[PDB]
Scaffold this active site. Sequence first.
Site, mmCIF file in Angstrom:
data_model
loop_
_atom_site.group_PDB
_atom_site.id
_atom_site.type_symbol
_atom_site.label_atom_id
_atom_site.label_comp_id
_atom_site.label_asym_id
_atom_site.label_seq_id
_atom_site.Cartn_x
_atom_site.Cartn_y
_atom_site.Cartn_z
ATOM 1 C CD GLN A 110 -2.624 1.254 0.108
ATOM 2 O OE1 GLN A 110 -2.320 1.865 -0.812
ATOM 3 N NE2 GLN A 110 -3.362 0.931 -0.375
ATOM 4 C CG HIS A 127 -51.654 14.243 -4.288
ATOM 5 N ND1 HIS A 127 -51.057 15.407 -5.101
ATOM 6 C CD2 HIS A 127 -50.641 13.643 -4.686
ATOM 7 C CE1 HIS A 127 -50.052 15.466 -5.525
ATOM 8 N NE2 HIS A 127 -49.913 14.440 -5.296
HETATM 9 ZN ZN LIG Z 1 -47.605 13.970 -5.157
#
Ligand SMILES: [Zn+2]
Lengths: 433, 433
Positions: free
Chosen positions: B260, B420
């Site tokens: 590393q 909605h």
């Molecule tokens: Zn919505």
Amino acid sequence: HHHHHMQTYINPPLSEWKNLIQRPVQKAEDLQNIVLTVFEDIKNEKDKALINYTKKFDKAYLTDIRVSSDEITAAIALVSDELIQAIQMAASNIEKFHASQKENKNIIETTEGVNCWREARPIENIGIYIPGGSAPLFSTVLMLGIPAQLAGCKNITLCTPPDESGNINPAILYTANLIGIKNIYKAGGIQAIGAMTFGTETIEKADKIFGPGNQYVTAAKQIAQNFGVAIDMPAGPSEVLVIADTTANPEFVAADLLSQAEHGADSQVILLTTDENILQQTLMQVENQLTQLPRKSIASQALLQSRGIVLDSIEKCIAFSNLYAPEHLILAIENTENYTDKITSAGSVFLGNFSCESAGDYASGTNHTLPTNGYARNYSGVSLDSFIKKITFQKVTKKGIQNIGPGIEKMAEAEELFAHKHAVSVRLKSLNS
Amino acid sequence: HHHHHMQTYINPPLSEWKNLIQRPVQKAEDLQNIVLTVFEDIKNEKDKALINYTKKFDKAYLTDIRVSSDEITAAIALVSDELIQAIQMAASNIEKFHASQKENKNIIETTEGVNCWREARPIENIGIYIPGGSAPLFSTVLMLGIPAQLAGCKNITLCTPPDESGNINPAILYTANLIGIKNIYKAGGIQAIGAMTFGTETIEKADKIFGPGNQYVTAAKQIAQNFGVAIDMPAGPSEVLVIADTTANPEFVAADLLSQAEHGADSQVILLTTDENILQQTLMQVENQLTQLPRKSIASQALLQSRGIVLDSIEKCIAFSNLYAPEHLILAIENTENYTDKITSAGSVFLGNFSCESAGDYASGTNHTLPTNGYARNYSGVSLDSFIKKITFQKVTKKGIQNIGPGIEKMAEAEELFAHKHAVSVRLKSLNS
Ligand SMILES: [Zn+2]
Ligand SMILES: N[C@@H](Cc1c[nH]c[nH+]1)C(=O)O
Ligand SMILES: N[C@@H](Cc1c[nH]c[nH+]1)C(=O)O
Ligand SMILES: [Zn+2]
């Protein structure tokens, strides 16, 4: 003398699609200095900055930033029994669908003596931002809190700004408490994002921050990345694209369009139809239904930037949709199973006449925190995956390293990385010895 | 008179861990104006900017940006048969492990009449950056190109800068051509990132850009996000943390640390041991092995910022490791199966004495493109997941909407979103009618 709200395009050529997929322009204010100044104040003054910015922008002078247990109890008693039942119904469906996303450990033997696999681990500290206002979008609490809990995230923080009296809407507190979020803070805007980015005396800092907000919250989340925190996805206004053939119900399609339009003046809706009669009937329904919306002013502003387009086949509509890359896609068509394979970019997809977007917004179980403004080209909606790290594991045996070892040595040599080669060589010589 | 390279800490208190987990500081240059200027040039001058910046920074005046088929053929003939065999061995293992990450479609019935599921779709346009120089890190081509191909990504671009004679290292071209990458461009630095972000006449723009680079490439990828492109993860120097008990092999552990350390002067290694004798033997091996490294100068600079720490139990070592969140974790201990569940942050984990990091770097099958500098707290390594979007689907039946519909209406009411609510109401009234 009719006032048409949405502009229409009848069989536009392919040369115009580049223009028809454009979202409305966004504000081009440079907020970097504004955000960095708030972040500096949060870094230097911590809780005092949180209180001072809350005084300035929320017009509330708080003594305590943290919501108390008495406030949680008071909120619970202000939520009706019928709403409680609905929220629990939604939470159960969201929990069921996100729990199904957990993967089983699957050990892969890539070659003899080399076993590799992945395991999930939770992101330890999760921050959730929830905008305030008179209309509580508490459904977002379910969408972000439930998969965080399922992932095993140990520290979940929720920030949401107080009203001028210092109060948080009762549905937000009820819903967060329901799904076990106990660390709830009265904070909004850039200063809330900064508090979760750097930490204060009261708010432990987050490893990853979730939840959309206004232009200031969006810029703050973008800049917060440069101080080491992860964020869920880039932001923008919400949108829907609907594809409708002769089997679609124009009353349903109009209602779906208007459900998206009422979100905000910057929302956009796109209607693609395979013939003009469907378009005309749907637009008539839009006009009639619009008159009944309490938010008709907001929806009307969004419709100004919206488009109805006639294209002469479903496959052309899908190709347009794939170029647009909608946040939500509604397939109001016959036999959707013949077409879903052809969808290549969309945040969430709704199939057939009874799959309305409102169901995904609230209760079907899918996540409504979705990439908008074309980010469906390169991001997913929030899911269980958003709350975990997938760690890779490997166990190489003595036979395993004898198997792949010589090849690794040759590749390390070609990359001129001698220590990489030597780390293999010492194992091989040990077994050969 | 011994020159010790790594600093040691014997049973530090928990109050000092905050300091012992720190990476070395990084450069604090503000590169935003520098990057934005290059991006403006790429936007305005396109291919001409690419050629002009390549002239300036790579000292190569190109006529063609795209690697030709004759150049690919010339490169293939310059790769030895033994390296070809090793690269094919690595590609097969990487392909096998990443192919296993594909998920099966799983339809979830969240409630009666509501079916939800997810499907993967490729990110369509993928950009890969590969640094240049005399030592070709062509293994990164396999790590990023193979999962892109498996995901079904249609357009894969690879940018890598020419040397002063206009040439690309043959192993890079061979390896990219092997796994089917055909769009290869002679370009580096900020201008390459800008070309993949905005597109030019020769380079189609990417949806997502992969691959680490220097400070300038890192800043360019960070800023490119603000123009709509996704990136794989944040960048930093590479690192390893090793946990070793009395069953570890000090020769192996020293070789792993040095593998590393030789990557770069800014790399960091951490060795945690359960007793001081393991630490002393491993450090002696480090000193002896360091003398043999052609890159000993680079590894020595990285060791200055590295730490060896004695802690009195494996569980304490794991707790330290979880706070550090290493890019690579090596468990050089007995019975690792009793401990892997306790690991909470690590990019990739190597189990037992024969699992060296070089194997994961090259050939085991795991991905070596991993989160560093503590980003293992909130990101994963690159995987098949990095190259796809997971689209959610739902199909709600008439019974389904009758089931969840009333609950949605109540939640929409509480969010004051009448459209909605109405989108559900019209379906219910239609079935009731
Ligand atoms: Zn919505
Ligand atoms: N099967 C893994 C979960 C996982 C998700 N992604 C990869 N793995 C575990 O044991 O936790
Ligand atoms: N099973 C999905 C793949 C997937 C990945 N993540 C979610 N789904 C498909 O059919 O493509
Ligand atoms: Zn390496």
